[PDB]
Write a protein that binds this ligand. Structure first.
Ligand SMILES: CS(=O)(=O)NCCc1ccc(F)cc1
Length: 119
């Protein structure tokens, strides 16, 4: 029932994501010099360095907010892809599965801790 435990759990999951080769296209903001269809199709860019810096700045109140930003990395990749078979999009699907598999307990524990706090 530790209401704060999610933050270090998210830091460690981000470390695992950065070690994963599938995170390479998503570690830093998309290069607008390399990708021109970018801001015309993506309204809210997101990447893992931005997520890590928001977390480290104390600018996430809950792991749900972090999850929303990580899910935006994946939905931006899906919206920008010219094909479901593209390399970057295929990497995003595997990385998303890995992320969802690991964030599930973080979210469950935090929501349970908050329910206990408010009992
Ligand atoms: C940091 S980068 O060197 O510009 N690589 C970005 C690859 C990418 C391009 C479009 C997307 F929707 C998602 C990822």
């Amino acid at each position: 029932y530790d209401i704060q435990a999610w933050k270090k759990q998210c830091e460690e999951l981000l470390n695992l994501i950065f070690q994963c080769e599938d995170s390479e296209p998503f570690r830093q903001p998309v290069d607008l010099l390399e990708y021109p269809d970018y801001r015309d199709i993506i309204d809210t860019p997101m990447d893992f360095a931005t997520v890590r810096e928001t977390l480290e700045a104390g600018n996430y109140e809950s792991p749900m907010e972090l999850c929303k930003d990580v899910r935006l990395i994946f939905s931006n990749s899906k919206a920008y892809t010219p094909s479901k078979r593209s390399r970057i999009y295929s990497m995003s699907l595997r990385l998303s599965a890995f992320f969802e598999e690991h964030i599930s307990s973080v979210l469950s524990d935090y929501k349970s801790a908050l329910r206990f706090h408010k009992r």
